[PDB]
């Protein structure tokens, strides 16, 4: 704690802790990202230069060409740690130090749509408008995870990229805490820099007209919604999107606002929902390439298919408002997914690819007094990532003792975590019990709960019944993750995990005049064959059976990509909740350290032979001791030297 702290009060944000590259939020500006530095760190082992991210980032590259292996960089930290910033910054780094489109390099609309190095870059600012928002911690917080594959060529020059998105905060779209706000886009658009848009979408410039997006805050001083709107705009173009699509995006993003304005009322003497007007529906309908009526019907009189037919079901006021919200979110998401794909599509070149460098940006194990479903998914991700490291280290360590000739035997450090992982991902584990019950037409959260216990309680060690008191809000089940005990609340899971959507409506989308909208829904339309009658399995036709069924699939496809990689680690840190440069709350940093892996890397180090010096890092600092004979050694063989 103390080392970090001291070199921070001195304004040094980069300090290493083994393999890690700790990074602390300056909260102010620094000449570090300096265009001089970039070069400086170019072609240098981390022992030839001071702690910095470009060190990691260059070495990767090096290593990439030297060993002929693919690489990775894992950036991770809490909401306010400032990872995007790094991630982005790493990315620029790659683009710079190994570009050369030759023709694209000239000062003629440089970096505009029409080159990648730019596309690559331009990517961000689009995603950010849609997947970023003002959090109470950050002003531009990443509300989703991501993985880019920079596909380097044979020579060593840029060839392709690849994005993938994980866990998007769908809730912002409909909600927002009091000090927060929704995605930027909304506020961007209503900013009025492109007035047509306002009339085009049929909205106003006052957000308080759109409940969905003004539950929290509307304006942020550090952000210029007007400037961004263009940034965004321009990015779309560069990204190669069709105007139409670029039109769908917009039009589609406004429909969603409108939905939240959709109002209903109880039919008299009936408990049914009946439309409270065709003012808004009209707009939503038009904007989506729909028919007002058909739309309001489907919404109100959802026509289902229980048995072997299609049974028309009536809904309540409360049921509608909620379904609407479900589509709003559903639509936004999908779209977001699409955009990514489309991006990827442009980022696809024909040129050969020999290796890639993966840059992973996701959240780290965060513990809250309230841990719900989303927490499990993330924690699980991290507990995996951790084991991923612990192993790499075990492998790594063991090489030294082999190189040197020491006689040290030890078991994989990952192993310690396998217990927790199996409990989650294995067959009779949490997810399964979670995803099975989702098949029971009449199951309860409570039901699920019991199934969870009857099977794991008393029989499983990592499994425990909660500690209901302290800063926690209710009881259901705790798990014993590497970072500690997490108290999980199971309420909504079943639902959240089912992704219930009014299929009648989706129908309409599926046959929209707005192709794009139509597209986004296709994959739902193609699995319906499979879940034709009441009860059963959605997967028969390609429909998701679990909220969690993919997450896993994606998380596997990932951790696999992570393996055929030479892992490079970066841990981002957040000094003080109060936003003050040169300061640090203790216990706050302490926390991160445990959940980071930093404290676990120190542990494993200390088992034993604590301090472990990297050879160059060893030369430089100590050559001077027998100056003649130690310098010769270090220079003559980077390793043999220290020897």
């Amino acid at each position: 704690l103390y080392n970090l702290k001291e070199r921070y009060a001195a304004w040094m944000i980069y300090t290493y802790s083994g393999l890690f590259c700790v990074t602390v939020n300056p909260y102010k500006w620094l000449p570090v990202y300096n265009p001089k530095v970039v070069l400086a760190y170019r072609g240098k082992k981390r022992q030839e230069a001071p702690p910095h991210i470009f060190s990691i980032s260059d070495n990767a590259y090096q290593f990439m060409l030297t060993d002929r292996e693919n690489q990775s960089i894992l950036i991770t930290g809490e909401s306010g740690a400032g990872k995007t910033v790094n991630t982005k910054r790493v990315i620029q780094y790659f683009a710079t130090i190994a570009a050369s489109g030759e023709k694209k390099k000239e000062e003629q609309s440089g970096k505009m749509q029409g080159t990648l190095e730019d596309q690559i870059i331009s990517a961000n600012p689009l995603l950010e408008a849609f997947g970023n928002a003002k959090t109470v911690r950050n002003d531009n917080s990443s509300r989703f995870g991501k993985f880019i594959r920079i596909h380097f060529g044979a020579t060593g020059k840029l060839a392709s990229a690849d994005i993938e998105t994980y866990l998007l905060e769908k809730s912002r779209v409909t909600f927002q805490l009091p000090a927060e706000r929704s995605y930027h886009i909304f506020y961007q658009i209503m900013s009025n820099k492109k007035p047509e848009l306002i009339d085009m979408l049929l909205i106003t410039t006052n957000p308080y007209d759109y409940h969905y997006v003004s539950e929290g805050e509307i304006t942020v001083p550090s952000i210029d919604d007007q400037e961004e709107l263009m940034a965004t705009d321009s990015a779309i173009d560069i990204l190669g999107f069709s105007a139409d699509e670029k039109t769908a995006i917009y039009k589609l993003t406004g429909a969603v606002m409108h939905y939240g304005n959709l109002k209903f009322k109880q039919k008299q003497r009936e408990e049914q929902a009946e439309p409270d007007g065709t003012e808004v529906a009209d707009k939503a309908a038009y904007l989506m390439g729909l028919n007002s009526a058909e739309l309001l019907k489907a919404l109100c009189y959802p026509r289902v298919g229980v048995g072997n037919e299609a049974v028309t079901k009536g809904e309540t006021v409360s049921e509608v408002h909620n379904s609407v919200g479900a589509l709003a979110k559903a639509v936004y998401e999908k779209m977001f997914l699409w955009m990514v794909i489309r991006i990827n599509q442009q980022l696809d070149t024909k040129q050969p690819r020999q290796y890639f460098i993966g840059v992973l940006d996701i959240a780290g194990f965060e513990i809250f007094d309230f841990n719900s479903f989303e927490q499990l998914c993330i924690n699980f991700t991290n507990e995996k990532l951790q084991q991923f490291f612990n192993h790499h280290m075990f492998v790594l360590e063991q090489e030294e003792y082999k190189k040197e000739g020491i006689e040290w035997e030890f078991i994989d450090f990952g192993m310690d975590l396998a217990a927790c992982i199996e409990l989650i991902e294995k067959p009779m584990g949490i997810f399964s019990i979670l995803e099975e019950e989702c098949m029971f037409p009449k199951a309860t959260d409570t039901s699920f709960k019991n199934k969870l216990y009857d099977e794991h309680l008393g029989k499983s060690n990592n499994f425990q019944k909660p500690k209901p008191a302290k800063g926690k809000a209710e009881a259901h089940f705790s798990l014993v993750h590497y970072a500690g005990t997490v108290d999980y609340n199971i309420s909504g899971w079943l639902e959240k995990n089912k992704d219930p959507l009014n299929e009648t409506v989706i129908g309409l989308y599926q046959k929209s005049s707005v192709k794009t909208l139509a597209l986004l829904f296709a994959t739902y339309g193609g699995e319906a064959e499979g879940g034709g009658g009441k009860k059963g399995g959605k997967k028969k036709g390609s429909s998701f059976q679990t909220v969690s069924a993919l997450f896993r699939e994606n998380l596997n496809k990932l951790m696999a990509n992570l393996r055929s990689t030479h892992p490079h680690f970066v841990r981002c840190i957040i000094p003080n909740e109060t936003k003050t440069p040169g300061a640090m709350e203790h216990e706050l940093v302490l926390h991160q350290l445990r959940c980071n892996g930093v404290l676990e890397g120190i542990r494993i180090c200390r088992k034993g032979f604590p301090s472990r010096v990297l050879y160059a890092d060893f030369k430089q600092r100590y050559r001077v001791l027998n100056a003649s004979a130690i310098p010769e050694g270090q220079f003559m063989d980077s390793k043999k030297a220290s020897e």
Partner: protein, 372 residues
């Protein structure tokens, strides 16, 4: 996805096989449960000598083959001929290779322990599937209607059953089987329609009596004053046009056929009927669970599709049940595939993965493993 896409669901019936991928909404494959064996030596033009025929090619070519039904009354009676229907299902109908697909199969209500072990022996040892699972049919039907306690009246082509289920466990001692179903029902219509002064003489006349039964048959409520209605001769009559012009009329018999399900006496059966049997199952169960079963009479099976079956059953058991009780007859529209859909749901489910019997379990525990 490995197996999210990959789980197969095969529902083996007395008349039809229903098959497809867990995930889908309805069976990808539906076909007769026959295996035809050619009575003479010879060939079709362009084909080779075929030793055997299955499903629709056995039905279509029935005049030169001896047709055989592997499943008598829901139970597999011939294992040589069943392995033939499975082979056809995987390789020709779904066109998948079985050795990379988990397979959820179904069995009947009081299916002998030894059979559940034998189809496991054949699934793992002759088809080499990665993993499999056998669900009980009424239990998948219930579950496909969302719930876990209820009583299923299940009725298909060779058997009818009542399977009371409580929090998922089908109750062995309360299950009733009535061997009169849609097969019996097509042959009775046949006679009341020849008896109306007709002739189903060629095989193109025989087959379509079954399509008359499906399209035009009804279960009237107050079957009493429906015969009475028949006589005053209302516009209750219904004429069907045959393969050719020969417009046949069916007024009345239209409902005399499903009245067989409430009155087995119409066909020289001395057994009790569907509604009484629903009830008797119920007064054979624990006392405290009888309000549950009564409010959850789930219907499944091709023969329970006759319109107005539910209303007749509704009133049939209200009037036998103590008035303090709530009666509730659930009959969904997709009911001819309830069983299958319940399997599709269950097998595509997030929590089912840990009940799949894997070749690891089998090679190590013997057929006993899946038998439970």
């Amino acid at each position: 996805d490995e197996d999210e896409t990959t789980a197969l669901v095969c529902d083996n019936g007395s008349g039809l096989v229903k098959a497809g991928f867990a995930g889908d909404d309805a069976p990808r494959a539906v076909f007769p449960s026959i295996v035809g064996r050619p009575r003479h030596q010879g060939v079709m033009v362009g084909m080779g000598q075929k030793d055997s025929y299955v499903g629709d090619e056995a039905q279509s070519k029935r005049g030169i083959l001896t047709l055989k039904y592997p499943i008598e009354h829901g139970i597999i009676t011939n294992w040589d001929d069943m392995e033939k229907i499975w082979h056809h299902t995987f390789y020709n109908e779904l066109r998948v290779a079985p050795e990379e697909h988990p397979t959820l199969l179904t069995e009947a209500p009081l299916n002998p322990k030894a059979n559940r072990e034998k189809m496991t022996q054949i699934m793992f040892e002759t088809f080499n599937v990665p993993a499999m699972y056998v669900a009980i049919q009424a239990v998948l039907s219930l579950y496909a209607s969302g719930r876990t306690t209820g009583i299923v009246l299940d009725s298909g082509d060779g058997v009818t059953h009542n399977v009371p289920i409580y929090e998922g466990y089908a109750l062995p001692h309360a299950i009733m089987r009535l061997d009169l179903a849609g097969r019996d029902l097509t042959d009775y219509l046949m006679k009341i329609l020849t008896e109306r002064g007709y002739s189903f003489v060629t095989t193109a006349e025989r087959e379509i009596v079954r399509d008359i039964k499906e399209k035009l048959c009804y279960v009237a409520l107050d079957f009493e004053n429906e015969m009475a209605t028949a006589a005053s001769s209302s516009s209750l009559e219904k004429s069907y046009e045959l393969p050719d012009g020969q417009v046949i009329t069916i007024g009345n018999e239209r409902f005399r056929c499903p009245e067989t399900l409430f009155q087995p006496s119409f066909i020289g059966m001395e057994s009790a009927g569907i509604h009484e049997t629903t009830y008797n199952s119920i007064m054979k169960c624990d006392i405290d669970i009888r309000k549950d079963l009564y409010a959850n009479n789930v219907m499944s099976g091709g023969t329970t599709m006759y319109p107005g079956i539910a209303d007749r059953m509704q009133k049939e058991i209200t009037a036998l049940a103590p008035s303090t009780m709530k009666i509730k007859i659930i009959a969904p529209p997709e009911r001819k595939y309830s069983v299958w859909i319940g399997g599709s749901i269950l097998a595509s489910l997030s929590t089912f993965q840990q009940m799949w019997i894997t070749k690891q379990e089998y090679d190590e525990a013997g057929p006993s493993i899946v038998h439970r």
